[PDB]
Amino acid sequence: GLMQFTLPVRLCKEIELFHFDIGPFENMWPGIFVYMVHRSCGTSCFELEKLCRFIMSVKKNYRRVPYHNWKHAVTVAHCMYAILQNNHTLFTDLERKGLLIACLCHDLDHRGFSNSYLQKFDHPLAALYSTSTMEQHHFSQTVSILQLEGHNIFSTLSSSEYEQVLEIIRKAIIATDLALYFGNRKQLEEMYQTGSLNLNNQSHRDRVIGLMMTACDLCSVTKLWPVTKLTANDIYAEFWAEGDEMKKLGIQPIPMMDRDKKDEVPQGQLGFYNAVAIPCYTTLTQILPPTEPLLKACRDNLSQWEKVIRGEET
Numbered sequence: 668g669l670m671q672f673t674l675p676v677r678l679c680k681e682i683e684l685f686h687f688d689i690g691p692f693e694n695m696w697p698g699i700f701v702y703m704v705h706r707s708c709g710t711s712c713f714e715l716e717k718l719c720r721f722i723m724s725v726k727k728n729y730r731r732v733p734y735h736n737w738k739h740a741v742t743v744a745h746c747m748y749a750i751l752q753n754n755h756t757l758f759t760d761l762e763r764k765g766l767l768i769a770c771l772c773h774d775l776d777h778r779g780f781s782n783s784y785l786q787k788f789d790h791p792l793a794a795l796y797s798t799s800t801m802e803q804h805h806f807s808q809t810v811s812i813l814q815l816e817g818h819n820i821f822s823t824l825s826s827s828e829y830e831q832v833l834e835i836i837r838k839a840i841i842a843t844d845l846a847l848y849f850g851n852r853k854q855l856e857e858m859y860q861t862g863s864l865n866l867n868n869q870s871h872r873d874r875v876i877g878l879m880m881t882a883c884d885l886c887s888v889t890k891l892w893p894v895t896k897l898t899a900n901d902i903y904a905e906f907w908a909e910g911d912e913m914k915k916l917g918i919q920p921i922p923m924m925d926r927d928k929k930d931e932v933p934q935g936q937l938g939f940y941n942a943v944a945i946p947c948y949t950t951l952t953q954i955l956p957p958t959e960p961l962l963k964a965c966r967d968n969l970s971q972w973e974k975v976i977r978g979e980e981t
């Protein structure tokens with residue numbers, strides 16, 4: 668109760684900033700997450716014995732893959748922390764509770780392959796979940812861990828409150844299926860520009876939370892350039908692994924996943940910032956103005972990719 672987590676001065680200052688990197692020391696990541704929960708939600712939101720148990724069970728069900736790993740999970744949770752701390756009054760006590768948990772859990776038991784590879788491999792999960800295959804699995808995995816002995820971090824919530832937070836977490840996790848982002852953003856774009864957007868409307872909150880979930884999921888493009896550049900090595904390691912597997916199925920993979928076409932990466936990253944990232948952070952800054960640093964940092968990294976193509980960098 669009166670046991671408060673403290674970080675060293677640099678982490679304690681840097682952690683409030685959107686572009687914060689959680690560093691290479693795994694054993695500090697759980698304490699970084701508990702520190703963020705206590706500050707976002709309160710020191711009384713969760714029982715520390717159950718939280719710590721939940722956090723280590725979630726860790727254990729993240730696989731040792733180049734990108735979609737325990738580190739990604741805590742990085743996406745930190746972005747959400749940054750957004751919630753800069754939009755203090757606009758979110759309920761349940762939403763703060765659920766959105767940090769959702770972010771930690773959003774890629775549970777990820778194997779490093781897209782929903783498409785699962786469908787073409789004819790994976791059992793692709794028979795069980797027709798769309799957002801992995802994301803339905805990540806939620807399933809979350810509920811399993813919440814149903815483990817001494818892992819129910821929402822024990823103090825009522826029947827109705829429990830159902831509401833699990834519904835927040837479910838929509839939040841489904842929303843990280845990028846294929847749904849495009850329509851979600853376009854609809855948010857139209858609602859903001861006509862003035863019909865209303866945060867008292869639940870279906871509108873759902874959409875805004877979904878865009879926050881995309882923004883947190885992509886926050887690798889909103890770090891300082893040295894971190895963005897090095898993260899990209901981890902992303903393409905999975906993509907090219909997936910391409911190799913497509914070639915084993917007898918399918919020529921998209922260039923993005925073809926390691927023979929790695930020379931086309933800088934221009935590929937250019938496309939992704941224009942088609943996905945900039946649009947995403949633009950609409951987010953429109954709806955939630957204090958999230959502007961994410962746009963600025965994204966814009967800065969777009970410019971760094973342009974310099975790579977021009978041959979000013981390697």
Ligand SMILES: Cn1ncc(C(=O)O)c1C(=O)Nc1ccn2cc(-c3ccccc3)nc2n1
Nearest residue numbers: 845885887902922923928931932935936938939
């Ligand atoms: C989902 N997600 N989350 C983070 C990131 C990220 O990249 O940081 C991504 C991601 O979708 N990236 C993309 C998207 C489209 N691409 C097309 C090429 C490309 C094409 C041709 C040749 C060489 C590369 N590379 C791409 N990378």
Ligand SMILES: [Mg+2]
Nearest residue numbers: 773774801843
């Ligand atoms: Mg995912």
Ligand SMILES: [Zn+2]
Nearest residue numbers: 773774843884
């Ligand atoms: Zn993710």
